[PDB]
Paper text:
Severe acute respiratory syndrome coronavirus 2 (SARS-CoV-2) infection is initiated by the trimeric spike protein that decorates the virus and binds the ACE2 receptor. SARS-CoV-2 infection is initiated upon attachment of the viral transmembrane spike (S) glycoprotein via a receptor-binding motif (RBM) to angiotensin-converting enzyme 2 (ACE2), leading to membrane fusion and entry into host cells.
Specifically, S2M11 CDRH1, CDRH2, and the heavy-chain framework region 3 (FR3) are docked into the RBM crevice (burying a surface of ~400 Å2), whereas CDRH3 spans the interface between the RBM and helices 339 to 343 and 367 to 374, as well as residue 436 of an adjacent RBD belonging to the neighboring protomer (i.e., burying a total surface of ~500 Å2). Three out of eight S2M11 heavy-chain residues that are mutated relative to contribute to epitope recognition (Ile54, Thr77, and Phe102), whereas none of the two light-chain mutated residues participate in RBD binding. The observation that all particle images correspond to closed S trimers when bound to S2M11 contrasts with our previous finding of ~50%/50% of trimers closed or with one RBD open in the absence of bound mAb or in complex with S309 (21) or S2H13 (28), which do not select for any specific RBD conformation. Moreover, S2M11-induced stabilization of SARS-CoV-2 S in the closed conformational state yields S trimers with masked RBMs that are incompetent for receptor engagement, as previously shown for an engineered S construct covalently stabilized in the closed state. We therefore interpret the biphasic binding as S2M11 interacting with a tertiary epitope present in open RBDs (fast off-rate), based on the identical kinetics and affinity measured relative to those of the isolated RBD, and S2M11 recognizing its full quaternary epitope (slow off-rate).
Residue numbers in the entry:
A (entry chain A): 327 to 573
B (entry chain B), C (entry chain E): 968 to 1016
D (entry chain B): 574 to 621, 641 to 671
E (entry chain H), F (entry chain F): 2 to 123
G (entry chain L), H (entry chain G): 1 to 105
I (entry chain B): 15 to 66, 78 to 143, 152 to 180, 185 to 243, 258 to 326
Write the structure that this text describes.
Amino acid sequence: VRFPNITNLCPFGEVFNATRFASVYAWNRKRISNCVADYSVLYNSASFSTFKCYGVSPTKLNDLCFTNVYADSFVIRGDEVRQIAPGQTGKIADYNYKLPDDFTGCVIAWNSNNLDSKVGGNYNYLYRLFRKSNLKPFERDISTEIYQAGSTPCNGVEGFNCYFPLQSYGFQPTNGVGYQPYRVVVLSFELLHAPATVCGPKKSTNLVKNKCVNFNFNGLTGTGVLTESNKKFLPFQQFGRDIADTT
Amino acid sequence: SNFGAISSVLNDILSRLDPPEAEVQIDRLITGRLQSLQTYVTQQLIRAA
Amino acid sequence: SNFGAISSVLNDILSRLDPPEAEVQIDRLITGRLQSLQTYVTQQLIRAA
Amino acid sequence: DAVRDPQTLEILDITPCSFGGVSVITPGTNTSNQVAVLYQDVNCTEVPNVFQTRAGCLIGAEHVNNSYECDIPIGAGIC
Amino acid sequence: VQLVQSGAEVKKPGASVKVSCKASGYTFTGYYMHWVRQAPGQGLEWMGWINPISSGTSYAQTFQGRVTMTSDTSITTAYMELSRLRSDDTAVYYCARAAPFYDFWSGYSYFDYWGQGTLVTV
Amino acid sequence: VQLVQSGAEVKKPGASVKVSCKASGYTFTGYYMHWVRQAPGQGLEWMGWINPISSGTSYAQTFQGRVTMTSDTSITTAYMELSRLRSDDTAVYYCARAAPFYDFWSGYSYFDYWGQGTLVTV
Amino acid sequence: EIVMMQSPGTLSLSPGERATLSCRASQSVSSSYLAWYQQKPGQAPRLLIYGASSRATGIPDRFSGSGSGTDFTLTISRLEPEDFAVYYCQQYGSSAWTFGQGTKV
Amino acid sequence: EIVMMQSPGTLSLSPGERATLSCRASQSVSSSYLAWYQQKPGQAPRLLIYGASSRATGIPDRFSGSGSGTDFTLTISRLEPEDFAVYYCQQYGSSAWTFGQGTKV
Amino acid sequence: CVNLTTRTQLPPAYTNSFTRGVYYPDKVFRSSVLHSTQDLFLPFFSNVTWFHRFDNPVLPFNDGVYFASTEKSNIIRGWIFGTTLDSKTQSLLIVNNATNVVIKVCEFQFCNDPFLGVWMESEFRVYSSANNCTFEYVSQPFLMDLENFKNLREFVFKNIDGYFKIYSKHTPINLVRDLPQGFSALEPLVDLPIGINITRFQTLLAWTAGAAAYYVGYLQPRTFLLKYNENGTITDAVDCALDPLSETKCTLKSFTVEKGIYQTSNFRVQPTESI
Ligand SMILES: *[C@@H]1O[C@H](CO[C@@H]2O[C@@H](C)[C@@H](O)[C@@H](O)[C@@H]2O)[C@@H](O[C@@H]2O[C@H](CO)[C@@H](O[C@@H]3O[C@H](CO)[C@@H](O)[C@H](O)[C@@H]3O)[C@H](O)[C@H]2NC(C)=O)[C@H](O)[C@H]1NC(C)=O
Ligand SMILES: *[C@@H]1O[C@H](CO)[C@@H](O[C@@H]2O[C@H](CO)[C@@H](O)[C@H](O)[C@H]2NC(C)=O)[C@H](O)[C@H]1NC(C)=O
Ligand SMILES: *[C@@H]1O[C@H](CO)[C@@H](O[C@@H]2O[C@H](CO)[C@@H](O)[C@H](O)[C@H]2NC(C)=O)[C@H](O)[C@H]1NC(C)=O
Ligand SMILES: *[C@@H]1O[C@H](CO)[C@@H](O)[C@H](O)[C@H]1NC(C)=O
Ligand SMILES: *[C@@H]1O[C@H](CO)[C@@H](O)[C@H](O)[C@H]1NC(C)=O
Ligand SMILES: *[C@@H]1O[C@H](CO)[C@@H](O)[C@H](O)[C@H]1NC(C)=O
Ligand SMILES: *[C@@H]1O[C@H](CO)[C@@H](O)[C@H](O)[C@H]1NC(C)=O
Ligand SMILES: *[C@@H]1O[C@H](CO)[C@@H](O)[C@H](O)[C@H]1NC(C)=O
Ligand SMILES: *[C@@H]1O[C@H](CO)[C@@H](O)[C@H](O)[C@H]1NC(C)=O
Ligand SMILES: *[C@@H]1O[C@H](CO)[C@@H](O)[C@H](O)[C@H]1NC(C)=O
Ligand SMILES: *[C@@H]1O[C@H](CO)[C@@H](O)[C@H](O)[C@H]1NC(C)=O
């Protein structure tokens, strides 16, 4: 088993215990790279109500390497948590935060009623209610242009068939669970044929040559015999392929 | 070829997914690879003739 | 033939469904049409012989 | 292959837009990089030394009245 | 659902008056706040509205250029500010709740909740 | 969330005192019960904790071997039993609620609810 | 603009009896945009009927409405002392809310 | 073990004014483990600030906290009669909860 | 900022891209093979816009761009990328000054005639205001020499899936007036993880004019057959959409075509109206 000899941990906690979460219409994105990602901490936690992985299993995350991890975060209403998934429709899935159908990542959510609700109502959390068309996966739209519902141009003015596109969640401590705020973190795992920069907490072993071994090179796995090569890899090339286009 | 699978590489499917999901992706590769192999053999039987 | 698809007509599948659903229906037509075409070619190779 | 128009009850016939295979006629690259192209079972009025033959529209080859032994077959007696 | 208005005000002609309306029991930004005036012995007159989510407004032509409507969602309160007052403005001012124009059913066409009126004398 | 403690006690040196703390308004077993002592004119001192789900404990070294903490989930009540009392133990004893050590956010690092203190004189 | 006219200006009847109030309009009004309000002396108006005929929440079944076009009515099947108040018709159209002059019961 | 030190032991100011209290530590403290409590005479302490800067539920926006390392503060933007109480800093580390000596306002 | 007005106004020049602009499409070593890839490439024999003077307006940035410079005295300094370039949106600035290379993705308010001046470096008049920094890099300091062409530098700029990808190649050149004929491949230089909307870009040059010229082409979705030699270097390529012979070469997966007739594609009349 061979992984880059890095020891710094990934700033996941910095995403999860942030004082302020974004509105879903204007969700935040943090790029995570060049670090060790321990996902057992997040998964084995008793604090999350939702922890759903798509594309990967939650118990194999620590054996994987990714080129990049994105951590998207926002607050939504409890009933809308089901919309943060592949293949969903609804006001959040369509106008605020869209996940691709081939999404690889984990959706993590927890009830944050004790942080985000106010007695008179917390009106700082917004969602897009109207949009001319659905969002593309991972698209943001933070405009406040008046939505034209009819055939008559609005010219920036609200009125009959002219709507302000955003609306607030009136988050109150007395709301039922489906109306309580949830903090959502979506971890998107990018996999392209490039150096991996985010790897789980795997220990490396000594390199063994001229013997049949089970190997794992920065996420590349297989069985074979490792020998010294006479191939001239260019400084940027990480692996090679045969005529058959196999490693 | 993926044949509809998330990956053409069997080891990658197995490194990411657990059996309840991995089997679905593997079935797609088996169907395609079995079909490709059957095509090869049929052509060799005709060519052999 | 539908081959399990909602329609034998590719344009009708695409006029009603979005890609996340259309692809499933299209895969059924591709599998069936590809199989039908392979059957035709195999018979022509044997017949040609 | 036919449809009745929904506003005026006219019957229209529907045919596909012209299509066909495209074949490239070439001496090997050891001799020349000049090529001729055959639009198979296509009219020379549909495609855009233009020779219309049974095999299709042959463009880039000069048609001559001198017969020779067959070299690169086009089809329908034409090489 | 409650709408609670400020107490009575007495102003000189040419002055300006501000009448608050505190909302509770509902999502403040989900509704429009309208104001309706009732001069003594008269019927009801619509003045205009404020949409708290965007602070969007519309005014009746009668008060257009005279009244400014604002709101503050942090305290779920609507304000009417009527300037250049005249004796003809002596009236009871009510705040009223109505649905936004996007309501599928015409909830914007009527006022389902009213605050207690605030008497303003000029 | 309420924490309700027993009334004041007066003991002779060498005696033992038991102070109850009844919890309500939350899942009892989801939190640790901590005890904090405050001698007159002094600051607050942490004594230890009891985890009701397992009756697991930890004590401050100062009271280790002197205090026993128990609980009874059927009546959602925590107990402190402080033995071998001395005059230096005259203090107000508070029960306090904190999250268990598995809380993702450090809810175990602080006390969010306190009962009324119980004065114990020795 | 549109004139909203109610009739009679004053209705006079006894408790226990039936009352009908009418609202006429210069121009045709969608039934969905017609509403009725009750204003007791010293109190804010409260909604009775909306959409021409639908009762507002908390309104007794004694109240009903109907109408279309230019002609709408409010009917009280049986009156109680509380019903001897001023009733208003209100309508939405264009971009404005128009009230009638009110009828006293 | 770690010494928790607050300063000044006594603060003196008038209602309507601003106050700042400090807590110093012998050793570095994660901000996530620092908390402040208010104790009015005759009452149990109640949480104000946790995680160095987060307000506890029910705490007025007048209270805020900040700090890192060995240096933490509690600030009251404007004082009311209720704020003239004893404030404590508390920290978690190791396997124990340590309080400062308290400062009186 | 300074507006330079002493400039002759001539129309744009155009040149032939020949077979330039090919880059390594991936990070995998392969050798003694012909590999077919679909990516954004500068089409062979494409129409390249050619600039000299102090010529450097804002140009479009589309799917990606190809940039090349011919110099004898290091006049080229760098590039500005963005959507509006006036602090309203995020923009990318890459500059090579006398002491180092700096890359910054701060919100900049750019000059409408940005430039550097120089033999020693002195003036720097690229932007005024700059805040809202999201990314920055500064290269280890070095001293740059500020005094026919000798140096050819080629760059490819792509903006895909959050990365601004820079590929580059340096070779000698020896002409007075043109872009060379021949083939070389551009190796990746850096992958910058910057999620910037780039639709426009501008070139920075370093009163008098120096001796330099630059060329701008545009990348298109094309299929290329790339020839890798024994050491995994791309030594040749076929643009499969250039002409019918190239199409045949791609179809047969070879750079050599034998005498014969090959079916390489399918002709189809496209619809012109929607009824
Ligand atoms: C928000 O969360 C971060 C990170 O939290 C960490 O990762 C999560 C996924 C969970 O596993 C957490 O339990 C885990 O702490 C906080 O920053 C980090 O806090 C920890 C714990 O105190 C620090 O560890 C200590 O480091 C010191 C050296 O300075 C050692 O002497 C200690 O023995 C111990 O190992 C860790 O270094 C620190 N990391 C960083 C980058 O600061 C963050 O403070 C927190 N903020 C709030 C308000 O809670
Ligand atoms: C360079 O010239 C441009 C115009 O091409 C100047 O930009 C204008 O500045 C005036 C103020 O003097 C504004 O009112 C115009 O709206 C601006 N026009 C544009 C297109 O932005 C620019 O200020 C000049 N720069 C310098 C240093 O002189
Ligand atoms: C080349 O660019 C670099 C990067 O901006 C310049 O280095 C900075 O110079 C400023 C101004 O004196 C300093 O405050 C920064 O601390 C420097 N940054 C670094 C990393 O050292 C450099 O001065 C520029 N060179 C020239 C000739 O203009
Ligand atoms: C509408 O369709 C009917 C079909 O019966 C046809 O007779 C009529 O002429 C059409 N009108 C127009 C304007 O096309
Ligand atoms: C093909 O080209 C080679 C030179 O590369 C030459 O030696 C050979 O004779 C040529 N053969 C034919 C048939 O032209
Ligand atoms: C091509 O079109 C012409 C009419 O312009 C017609 O006379 C000729 O026969 C057609 N040829 C073929 C092959 O269709
Ligand atoms: C062949 O000869 C005829 C005359 O008999 C002439 O009309 C025709 O154009 C010639 N064709 C070619 C290809 O030269
Ligand atoms: C490039 O396009 C322009 C505009 O049509 C044209 O004038 C010029 O000759 C073309 N140059 C080349 C090399 O194709
Ligand atoms: C940075 O962007 C925010 C908007 O997200 C804006 O409010 C802020 O003023 C910008 N910073 C500066 C220095 O302009
Ligand atoms: C870049 O900005 C333009 C507006 O000038 C917009 O139309 C386009 O969609 C934006 N591209 C992206 C990726 O946001
Ligand atoms: C490969 O590299 C070697 C140097 O190790 C060189 O001698 C040889 O000519 C190169 N081969 C090719 C095809 O460039």
